[PDB]
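User: Design a sequence. Structure:
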């Protein structure tokens, strides 16, 4: 199933601290954000995605079409410009964010009814798991 539509509530968050530190998020912001539980609202229509991640402190939005490279300004996080491209590797949705940081991107997939989001930057990998609400 390649269907990420819906509202998703975080159940687990592994190594979010490492990912944020790899992005150079300022200490105070990072210390608060590592504590947070996130909710995702995903609108998926063909290749068109509108994504909205929310918490009490850090909110992140991205819109894209699969297979269409786009400029992303990561102003809610590290405030960098990346050239982002989201494509399918099987049923895994894969984003590569080309720019200053090496190995920067994310992957997302459904397994056992749960949504998995893997965030990478540098040598850090963060794994988040969400249940469908
Ligand atoms: C799956 C597509 C939409 C979607 C992509 C997405 C990408 C990244 C992201 N984060 C890292 C900057 C915050 C946890 C959250 C996201 O949330 C989404 O809903």
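Assistant: Done.
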């Amino acid at each position: 199933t390649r269907d990420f539509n819906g509202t998703w509530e975080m159940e687990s968050n592994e190594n979010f601290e490492g990912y944020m530190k790899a992005l150079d998020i300022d200490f105070a912001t990072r210390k608060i954000a590592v504590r947070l539980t996130f909710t995702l609202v995903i609108d998926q229509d063909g290749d068109n995605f509108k994504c909205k991640a929310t918490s009490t402190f850090l909110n992140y939005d991205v819109d894209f079409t699969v297979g269409v490279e786009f400029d992303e300004y990561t102003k809610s996080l590290d405030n960098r410009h990346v050239k982002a491209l989201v494509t399918w590797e099987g049923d895994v949705l894969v984003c590569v964010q080309k720019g200053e940081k090496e190995n920067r991107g994310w992957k997302k997939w459904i397994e056992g009814d749960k949504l998995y989001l893997e965030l990478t930057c540098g040598d850090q990998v963060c794994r988040q798991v969400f249940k469908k609400k």
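The chain has one domain: 6-132. The beta strands are 6-14, 39-45, 48-54, 60-65, 70-73, 81-89, 92-98, 105-111, 114-121, 124-132.
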